[PDB]
Design a protein around this ligand. Structure first.
Ligand code: 93K
Length: 165
């Protein structure tokens, strides 16, 4: 019934920062929401714990989820290396939207991004599947460690993650 909620405990060069929680829209995009949920608990034997936000651009997005190559070239889903664009019902409306990164049509894996601005040009190209629930302040603090080209000035990690309730 109820959309699941997941959390990320963020650290900055190993130092705890705070918690970000997300609502996952399992009601509209169940296959995409289930992938992010399972990667957040680690219940398939792999996932987001210990991974980093490798590309942060202030006024745009924070991108993470590459737990196999640590730099934007890797990751895998719970369904195999890649899976299809499930639907484009939800749009990139503003800060806090959670959406899938990709390298072309039907190439979703584990990488994702949190919007820090409206990114409407991505509508119909990236699958939106959730939003920040609590901790947008923590996202804003992360965002300050980014740069124009995306390289971070300190290492931004998911020290822990899982499901709430
Ligand atoms: N830019 C890339 O090479 C890339 C982005 C998203 C993905 N999910 C994968 N697998 C690769």
């Amino acid at each position: 019934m109820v959309n699941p909620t997941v959390f990320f405990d963020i650290a900055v060069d190993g130092e705890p920062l705070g918690r970000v929680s997300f609502e996952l829209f399992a009601d509209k995009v169940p296959k995409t929401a289930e992938n992010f949920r399972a990667l957040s608990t680690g219940e398939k034997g792999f996932g987001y714990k210990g991974s980093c936000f490798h590309r942060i651009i202030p006024g745009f997005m924070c991108q993470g989820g590459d737990f196999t190559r640590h730099n934007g070239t890797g990751g895998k889903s719970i369904y195999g290396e890649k899976f299809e664009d499930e639907n484009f019902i939800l749009k990139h409306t503003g800060p806090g939207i959670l959406s899938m990164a990709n390298a072309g049509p039907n190439t979703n894996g584990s990488q994702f991004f949190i919007c820090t601005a409206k990114t409407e040009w991505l509508d119909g190209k990236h699958v939106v599947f959730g939003k920040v629930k609590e901790g947008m302040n923590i996202v804003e603090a992360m965002e300050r460690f980014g740069s124009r080209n995306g390289k971070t000035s300190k290492k931004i990690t998911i020290a822990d993650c899982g499901q709430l309730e």
